[PDB]
Design a protein around this ligand. Sequence first.
Ligand SMILES: Nc1nc(=O)c2nc(CNc3ccc(C(=O)N[C@@H](CCC(=O)O)C(=O)O)cc3)cnc2[nH]1
Ligand SMILES: [Cl-]
Length: 159
Amino acid sequence: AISLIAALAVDRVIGNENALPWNLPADLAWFKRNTLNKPVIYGRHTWESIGRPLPGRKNIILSSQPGTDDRVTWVKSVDEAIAAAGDVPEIFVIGGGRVYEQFLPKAQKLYLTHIDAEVEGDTHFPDYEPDDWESVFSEFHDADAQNSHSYSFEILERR
Ligand SMILES: Nc1nc(=O)c2nc(CNc3ccc(C(=O)N[C@@H](CCC(=O)O)C(=O)O)cc3)cnc2[nH]1
Ligand SMILES: [Cl-]
């Protein structure tokens, strides 16, 4: 089954021109624990942002442009990306915006981090109908010595 994971600032903005103005190691830990040892799908731009494959995970990159690396799997379509992932219980889509958009219709779960930050950004997470989804988990955290902003984790399951 397909799962989407993302960190959202106020107004569902997932990023912009510049680096994100928050320090949230707690979110990174949450991200690792949920995606560890599972196939992860992402686009050309996210690849460029990280530069190297994510450890212990099966990296699948959706790109219309030919692949430039042998350590990760390169696909040209959504159907091909899902096939390259295999017959595993859970497959994660980790971005970016246009990729989340193509995968939302087929997602069964949403792992969201709601960050209390007013970030003026260009890219937004797709709008999802609240009625089509059930919030089976939500946990609120305040900012602390390690995390700069207050935030909440949420797991939604498709109805
Ligand atoms: N919750 C959530 N937080 C994110 O930061 C996030 N980032 C993406 C896409 N961008 C990125 C950028 C960097 C790494 C990365 O280098 N992660 C390392 C953790 C490093 C670490 O703390 O060891 C990883 O191994 O997962 C992953 C995704 C998608 N969904 C997200 N979702
Ligand atoms: Cl991307």
